[PDB]
């Protein structure tokens, strides 16, 4: 298991060693708090700020990770997904 922490946001990713990843997201803040809905069917984690969708995080098997933002309305994905390089570019996605 891996556990990243940014401010009051805790992101936990763990493989159940039989080949099954499942990401969990938790935030302690009481305002502008993040929450995540995990869709194991596509290994996509959707982050919402105060119940409003903001970014999609796809943790594929290839090992890599991608991130894409929703429009201002918070209903659909915009532009094109990007690949996360380092944990310095990954800690931003949790702000």
């Amino acid at each position, epitope marked *: 298991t891996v556990e990243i922490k940014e401010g009051t946001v805790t992101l936990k990713r763990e493989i159940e060693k039989d080949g099954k990843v499942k990401v969990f997201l938790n935030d302690t803040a*009481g*305002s502008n708090k993040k929450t995540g809905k995990w869709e194991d069917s596509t290994s996509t984690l959707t982050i919402s700020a105060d119940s*409003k*969708k903001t970014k999609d995080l796809v943790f594929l098997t290839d090992g890599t990770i991608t991130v894409q933002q929703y429009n201002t*309305a918070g209903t659909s994905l915009e532009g094109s997904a990007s690949e996360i390089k380092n944990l310095s570019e990954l800690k931003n996605a949790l702000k």
Partner: antibody, heavy 120, light 108 residues
Framework: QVQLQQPGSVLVRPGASVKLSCKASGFTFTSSWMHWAKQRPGQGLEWIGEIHPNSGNTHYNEKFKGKATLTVDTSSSTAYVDLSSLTSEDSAVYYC?????????????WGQGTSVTVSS | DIQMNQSPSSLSASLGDTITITCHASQNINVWLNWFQQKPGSIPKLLIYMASNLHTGVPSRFSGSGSGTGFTLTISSLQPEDIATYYCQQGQSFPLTFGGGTKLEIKR
């Protein structure tokens, strides 16, 4: 229970400016998304914008950008709209409402509205 | 910038009747559509969200369907308290836009 208080009506001269208030109670204000809309007699509803109280971040309807500015005050749980250099086209009812996301994505609570008159 | 059109623009119906109100959008919005009711000199009231879900407190004789570019509100067994103007609103993308509205009258 969620309540949104707005003054009933206000009179203001042409070219002048006005400040509209909307006091919220019944839910966590800093944790919300407040919206404003206007409705002129028998003309329908026009969307003005949205503000996330916890930061002051806003999203405007381009046709109001220079006319209206949204702001808040976390300490008194109040949302505001400032209208500048009013004209006759500004006379109308202005509503504040709470937008709830999640599985809803709809404005389920509205204020009584403030009837505004632009006359000399 | 989505344009919403409603039809009919107004209608007369008898008590007990079942009426239909349709709303069409400029572009695909998939299911991001709401229905509001406004009685004369009163405030807007949420009826249906995400094109087919009833909002608490609303009589089950109200229902909606559709997706894409067409959505219809159905009102069965028309009651005297249904005398209102109804509006559809898309929340697909900013700015949010409302349809012109459909005014309802009871025929006698």
């Amino acid at each position: 229970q969620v309540q949104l208080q707005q003054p009933g009506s206000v009179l203001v001269r042409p070219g002048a400016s006005v400040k509209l208030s909307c006091k919220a109670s019944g839910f966590t204000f800093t944790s919300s998304w407040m919206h404003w809309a206007k409705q002129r007699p028998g003309q329908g509803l026009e969307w003005i914008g949205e503000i996330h109280p916890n930061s002051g971040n806003t999203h405007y309807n381009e046709k109001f950008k220079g006319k209206a500015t949204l702001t808040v005050d976390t300490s008194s749980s109040t949302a505001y709209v400032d209208l500048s250099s009013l004209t006759s086209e500004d006379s109308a009812v202005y509503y504040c409402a709470r937008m709830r996301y999640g599985d809803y994505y709809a404005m389920d609570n509205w204020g009584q509205g403030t009837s505004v008159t632009v006359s000399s | 910038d989505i344009q919403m059109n409603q039809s009919p623009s107004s209608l007369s119906a008898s008590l007990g009747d079942t009426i239909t109100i349709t709303c069409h959008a400029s572009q695909n919005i998939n299911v991001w559509l709401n229905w509001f009711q406004q009685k004369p000199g009163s405030i807007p009231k949420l009826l249906i969200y995400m094109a087919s879900n009833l909002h608490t407190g609303v009589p089950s004789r109200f229902s909606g369907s559709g997706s894409g570019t067409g959505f219809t509100l159905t009102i069965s067994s028309l009651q005297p308290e249904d005398i209102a103007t109804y509006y559809c609103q898309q929340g697909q993308s900013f700015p949010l836009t409302f349809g012109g509205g459909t005014k309802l009258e009871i025929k006698r």
